[PDB]
Design a protein around this ligand. Structure first.
Ligand SMILES: [Ca+2]
Ligand SMILES: [Ca+2]
Ligand SMILES: [Ca+2]
Ligand SMILES: [Ca+2]
Ligand SMILES: [Ca+2]
Ligand SMILES: [Ca+2]
Ligand SMILES: [Cl-]
Ligand SMILES: [Cl-]
Lengths: 17, 17
């Protein structure tokens, strides 16, 4: 769901940084 | 979709390790 998606995008942010 | 979900679970695995 929506929360899973937001958490996913934060994992992507963490890895990109 | 399905690929997004698999990629998400791998990010979770990478972080847990
Ligand atoms: Ca949230
Ligand atoms: Ca959350
Ligand atoms: Ca979060
Ligand atoms: Ca795959
Ligand atoms: Ca893939
Ligand atoms: Ca992969
Ligand atoms: Cl880095
Ligand atoms: Cl670690």
């Amino acid at each position: 769901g929506e929360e899973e998606l937001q958490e996913n995008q934060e994992l992507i942010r963490e890895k990109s940084n």
